[PDB]
Design a protein around this ligand. Structure first.
Ligand SMILES: NC(=O)c1ccc[n+]([C@@H]2O[C@H](COP(=O)([O-])OP(=O)(O)OC[C@H]3O[C@@H](n4cnc5c(N)ncnc54)[C@H](OP(=O)(O)O)[C@@H]3O)[C@@H](O)[C@H]2O)c1
Ligand SMILES: NC(=O)c1ccc[n+]([C@@H]2O[C@H](COP(=O)([O-])OP(=O)(O)OC[C@H]3O[C@@H](n4cnc5c(N)ncnc54)[C@H](OP(=O)(O)O)[C@@H]3O)[C@@H](O)[C@H]2O)c1
Lengths: 305, 305
């Protein structure tokens, strides 16, 4: 409570709280209680999406705190994402309007395209053919982007950005003739093992913020790899040295390099743990040491990449 | 209520209700309410497992109905499965005892080895190296089997069987010198696209019942063939002809060929739908037609095979 709700600038004049809180269940019912505990602890940046099927639950939690006067609408930064089946220029706002109806907020502070790939419009999140294969559809991202800009103009989304865009896809938008508004962020997976320096540097020059997910490394018989990031000896070494936890040093690392981290805990003790992230600093030797962990490993829980 | 709780013989003198009900969440809290609605509708065969982490919830649901006198302990057939970390002969009963403690039942009607592979004993379901790879362990299934037989002798498990065993693994048990009790079943994935005729015929000769899961066909950008079995045109054709639903014909097909199906619905209308499965019959032309769908596709949601 206090510093983790302080803001960083967006290229459109808006500011975003420096630490975000993800809203993804693993009972929907627990989402609302976690959001409430999070808000009481200083969190002002909530990240959800159409896909998550929990925006209703997140709205109730947010509005409970507006009602009890803990927070005002303007104190909350709420992010939502456009789902793939709604990539057609005409269906973009349909998607956003469903979010606004579900959350009961008048607008969203940040609307971002969840993925660049488009899927056929329907009532299914991931539609498939007879052989159970995804029904992709070709819709030029510049067309979806234009629809996004219309959303911002209509005042339904304060800011607009993207998520999971690579260098060429990001450039495509930036070089689209008649660009009205450029993305304010690029939400990508980023952590000690997949640090995204190229992407980060590119963003800094384009004046775009990189929002990280799977920051702390995020039951089946097969997948062979997933090293548990928080068990890393170098990390545990440096945590032990600063008398911190592996998770805080991992988070502090993202903050010091200019990334707006996304975290998520449904545990009241771990939620409070995270608010102490600004209580120390990583000395450069330690920063370089951490940069060394980059082994380019992607968890890609969504099997997208 | 009435016919779906009628029993079929087991090779050890016991009988098993003809239609089973699976207990796998997708809130634990909803499991107990579904089990109760299921029991009120005639279901007497409940299938759970150590792995599911819901045996406690299933016990409360079962015992609520014993208490209200709807059902007696002897009317319920409860199945549980030995988890892989408990494959060592010494840890087998530890596993079963945890189940009995968790469910508060004096014994289980059927105890089966969930998978043939063994994993190192621990407090983790799926233990992995510092490199994200499963800690397998070699324990001869005939040794685990011997431990199982001891469970039946101790009267902790009325019947014992296996799950996910292929032809050679199944034979290994059947040919183990000094076999005391042979498995009563082999719980395997079986449905219109993966019908298991070889396995079924083998079982019929060995006098072993084949219990099916993923009967009705049971997400992600994985262009991962997830053909929706209930959307199959041939199925929908034959359903339409009998004025039934795709799901009932799919279920009736398993019943007519000698399989004890496992189903699962947390929806009170679909639970009641399923009790009407014996209200019609599939004429042989239709049976052969359905047999034709066998395209050998495995959903293997557990990524085991
Ligand atoms: N744009 C996209 O495509 C995309 C994709 C994935 C996620 N996201 C966003 O990112 C959010 C978080 O994603 P994620 O869960 O994958 O990221 P993550 O933060 O790396 O993983 C969350 C895990 O960290 C554990 N944890 C939390 N606080 C901790 C602490 N103090 N110490 C140790 N462990 C801690 C949590 O478990 P416990 O509760 O046990 O601590 C949880 O299992 C999502 O809700 C969503 O908002 C976006
Ligand atoms: N031995 C093993 O390794 C193993 C592995 C997997 C499963 N199992 C057992 O099998 C049980 C069921 O497994 P499963 O869920 O994979 O099998 P499944 O029955 O093929 O899949 C269940 C799905 O069928 C839908 N459904 C249920 N009734 C329906 C109806 N009347 N009409 C149309 N759809 C219907 C349910 O959703 P709705 O609620 O929306 O209807 C649910 O999504 C498990 O709980 C477990 O007991 C064992």
């Amino acid at each position: 409570m206090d510093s983790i709700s302080l803001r960083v600038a967006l290229n459109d004049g808006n500011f975003i709280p420096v630490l975000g809180f993800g809203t993804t269940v693993p009972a929907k019912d627990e989402v609302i209680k976690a959001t409430k505990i999070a808000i009481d602890n200083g969190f002002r940046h909530f990240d959800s999406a159409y896909l998550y099927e929990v925006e209703e639950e997140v709205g109730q939690a947010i509005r409970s705190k507006i009602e009890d006067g803990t927070v005002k609408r303007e104190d909350i930064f709420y992010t939502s994402k456009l789902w793939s089946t709604f990539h057609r220029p005409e269906l973009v706002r349909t998607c956003l309007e469903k979010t606004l109806k579900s959350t009961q907020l008048d607008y969203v502070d940040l609307y971002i395209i969840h993925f660049p790939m488009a899927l056929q419009p329907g009532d299914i999140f991931f539609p498939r053919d007879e052989h159970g294969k995804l029904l992709f559809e070709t819709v030029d991202i510049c067309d979806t982007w234009e629809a996004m800009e219309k959303c911002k103009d209509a005042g339904l989304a304060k800011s607009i950005g993207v998520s999971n865009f690579n260098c060429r896809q990001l450039e495509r938008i930036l070089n689209k003739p008649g660009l009205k508004y450029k993305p304010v962020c690029n939400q990508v997976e980023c952590h000690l093992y997949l640090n995204q320096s190229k992407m980060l540097d590119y963003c800094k020059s384009k004046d775009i913020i990189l929002v990280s997910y799977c920051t702390l490394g995020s039951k089946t018989w097969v997948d062979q790899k997933s090293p548990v990031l928080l068990d890393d000896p170098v990390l545990c070494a440096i945590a032990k040295k600063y008398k911190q936890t592996p998770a805080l040093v991992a988070l502090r690392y993202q903050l010091q390099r200019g990334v707006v981290p996304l975290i998520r805990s449904f545990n009241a003790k771990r939620i409070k743990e995270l608010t102490q992230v600004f209580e120390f600093q990583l000395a450069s030797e330690d920063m370089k040491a951490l940069d060394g962990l980059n082994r380019n490993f992607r968890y890609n829980n969504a099997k997208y990449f």
